[PDB]
């Protein structure tokens, strides 16, 4: 009907349980508890003239694409022909109006004192400020933060398999490209399921979990389509995105532009292969595992992931990798 007050999405008990879990130029992310269940709350200032975290705020029209994409991908958990739970669940979206809640400022301050923030303290917003508030499934901790915490390369294999299957299902259903799948955008949480289920073009299969559920996040650069209407971020005139250095991540932006001839509206699912390659490279070169490959069977998984790294760039999509690559047989 119109924007709601913060206390609509965050009644006092929910607000009092908020702890800050992450941040970016976009704003802030909190974990809280609703009906005994953790959820993640992402809060983005929109439509105002103030710089926030050094950048202008998005308009409603600029933020809408990523909300639409979020929802489409979340909806794949309930589909039939192309079904996956490997994208973050989206529970609700609200437009809220007001100054920033003092209880969230307390949470922001605690994070700043313990971990340090790159952001502005969000205490300067007036009572007319608009925000989008997204409530997500709680996805756990990002892969970059788990650099030293995973059990073994068996776990790495599960994570790669989960990511490849989820991307394949989204290619098949939505002609999806993530386009920014760095290791801060892969979330890991514990699961008691021994195996995870997906369906790709009507064929169902399973993935051993190694006790982890992967969730893909962050759709600001993503592209998909339904009945020929394409939702995508046109970065064709962006300069900075293609001039980064110091990590293979920044090559991937350039490699995508090469692949698509700088036409971001087109469908090039090879971009998903490029991100999976980047992720595999991180698994082999930056991750460090609690148990190394000390037995024949583990040394074989290491060799298969090494083979994946050397061969996967000859595949045309995540779908091609899932269906044809020997790693997943
Ligand atoms: O943009 C989205 O699609 C997005 C969706 C879900 C979450 C965050 C998102 O963006 C902000 C990313 O930066 C925070 C990093 N860490 C964590 C940790 C745990 N969760 N659980 C959900 C999210 C989350 N983020
Ligand atoms: Na999910």
Angle CA 23–15–77, to nearest 5: 65
Secondary structure of the chain in the HEC alphabet? CCCECHHHHCCHHHHHCCEEEEEECCEEEEEEEECCEEEEEEEEEECCCCEECCEECECHHHHHHHHHHHHHHHHHHHCCCCECCCECCEEEEEEEECCCCHHHHHHHHHHHHHCCCCCCCCCCCCCCCEEEEEEEECCCEECHHHCCCCCCHHHHHHHHHHHHHHHHHHHHHHCCECCCCCCCCEEEEECCCCEEEEEECCEEEEEECCCEEEEECCCCCCEEEECCEEEECCCCCCCHHHCCCCCHHHHHHHHHHHHHCCCCCCCCCHHHHHHHHHHHHHHHHCCCCCCCCCCHHHHHHHHHHHHHHHHHHHCCCHHHHHHHCHHHC
CB 207 within 8 A of CB 194: no
Annotated ligand binding at 153? The verdict is no
Protein residue with its CA nearest to atom 14 in ligand 1: 22
Closest ligand to C-alpha of residue 218 is 1
C-alpha 8/C-alpha 13 separation (Å) is 12
Q: What are the residue boundaries of the structural domains of the chain, listed by start?
A: 1-138, 139-329
Bridge partners (DSSP) listed for residue 213: 189
Protein residue with its CA nearest to atom 3 in ligand 1: 218
Closest ligand to C-alpha of residue 217 is 1
CATH topology of domain 1-138: Phosphorylase Kinase; domain 1 (3.30.200)
- Give the nearest ligand 1 atom to 184 CA: 15
Question: What count of other Cβ atoms lies within 10 Å of the Cβ of residue 11?
Answer: 11
C-alpha 42/C-alpha 44 separation (Å) is 7
Q: Which of 35, 109, 180, 281 is catalytic?
A: 180
Protein residue with its CA nearest to atom 1 in ligand 1: 218
**Which residues, judged by CB distance below 6 Å to any ligand atom, belong to the binding site of ligand 1?**
21-22, 24, 29, 40, 42, 70, 88, 136, 138-140, 142, 187, 217-219
- Give the nearest ligand 1 atom to 22 CA: 14
| Cα 152 to averaged position of ligand 1 atoms, centre (Å) | 25
Bridge partners (DSSP) listed for residue 296: none
Question: What count of other Cβ atoms lies within 10 Å of the Cβ of residue 93?
Answer: 15
Residue of 22, 38, 189 with the most ligand 1 atoms within 8 Å of its CB, for mutation: 22
Structure tokens at 172: 């098949």
Residue 181 has φ and ψ, to the nearest 5°, of: -90, 60
Annotated ligand binding at 123? The verdict is no
Per-residue exposure over 94-116, b if at least 16 CB sit within 10 Å of its own CB, e if not = bebebebbebbeebbeebeeeee
Calculate the alpha carbon distances from 222 to 23, 48, 112, 189, 219 in Å: 19, 24, 30, 23, 5
Q: Resolution of the coordinates in A?
A: 1.8
- Give the nearest ligand 1 atom to 70 CA: 3
- Give the nearest ligand 1 atom to 29 CA: 14
State the method. X-ray
Q: Which residue has the tokens 């991180």?
A: 282
Q: Which one of 3.40.50.970, 1.10.510.10, 1.10.150.120, 3.40.140.80 gives the CATH number of domain 139-329?
A: 1.10.510.10
C-alpha 27/C-alpha 220 separation (Å) is 13
Whether 240 is catalytic is no
Annotated ligand binding at 183? The verdict is yes
Please state at what angle helix 296-311 crosses helix 270-285, rounded to 10 degrees: 140
Annotated ligand binding at 23? The verdict is yes
Protein residue with its CA nearest to atom 6 in ligand 1: 217
Annotated ligand binding at 52? The verdict is no
| Cα 65 to averaged position of ligand 1 atoms, centre (Å) | 17
| Cα 85 to averaged position of ligand 2 atoms, centre (Å) | 4
Residues whose CB is less than 8 angstroms from the CB of residue 249 and which lie 6 or more positions away in sequence, other chains included: 182, 278
């Amino acid at each position: 009907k119109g924007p709601v007050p913060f206390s609509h999405c965050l009644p006092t008990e929910k607000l009092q349980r908020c702890e800050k879990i992450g941040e970016g130029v976009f704003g802030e992310v909190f974990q809280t508890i609703a009906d005994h269940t953790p959820v993640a709350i992402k809060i983005i200032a929109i439509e105002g003239p103030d710089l926030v975290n050094g950048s202008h705020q998005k308009t409603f029209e600029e933020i809408l694409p990523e909300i639409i994409i979020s929802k489409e991908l979340s909806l794949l958990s309930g589909e039939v022909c192309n079904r996956t739970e490997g994208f973050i669940g989206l529970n609700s979206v609200h437009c809220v109006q007001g100054s920033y809640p003092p209880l969230l400022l307390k949470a922001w301050d605690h994070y700043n004192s313990t971990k340090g923030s790159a952001n502005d303290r969000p205490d300067f917003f007036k009572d007319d400020q608009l925000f989008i508030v997204l409530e997500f499934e709680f996805g756990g901790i990002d892969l970059e933060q788990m650099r030293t915490k995973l059990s073994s390369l068996a776990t790495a294999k599960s994570i790669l398999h989960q990511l490849t299957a989820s991307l394949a299902v989204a290619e098949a259903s939505l002609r999806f490209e993530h386009r920014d799948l760095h290791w801060g955008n892969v979330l890991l949480k514990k699961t008691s399921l021994k195996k995870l289920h997906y369906t790709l073009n009507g064929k169902s299969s399973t993935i051993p979990s190694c006790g982890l559920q992967v969730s893909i996040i962050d759709y600001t650069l993503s592209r998909l389509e339904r009945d020929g209407i394409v939702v995508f971020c046109d970065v064709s005139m962006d300069e900075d995105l293609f001039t980064g250095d110091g990590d293979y991540q920044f090559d991937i932006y350039r490699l995508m532009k090469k692949e698509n001839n700088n036409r971001w509206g087109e469908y090039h699912p090879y971009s998903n292969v490029l991100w999976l390659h980047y992720l595999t490279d991180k698994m082999l070169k930056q991750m460090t595992f609690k148990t190394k490959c000390n037995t024949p069977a583990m040394k074989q998984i290491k060799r298969k992931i090494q083979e994946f790294h050397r061969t996967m760039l000859n595949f045309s999509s995540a779908t091609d990798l899932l269906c044809q690559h020997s790693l997943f047989k």
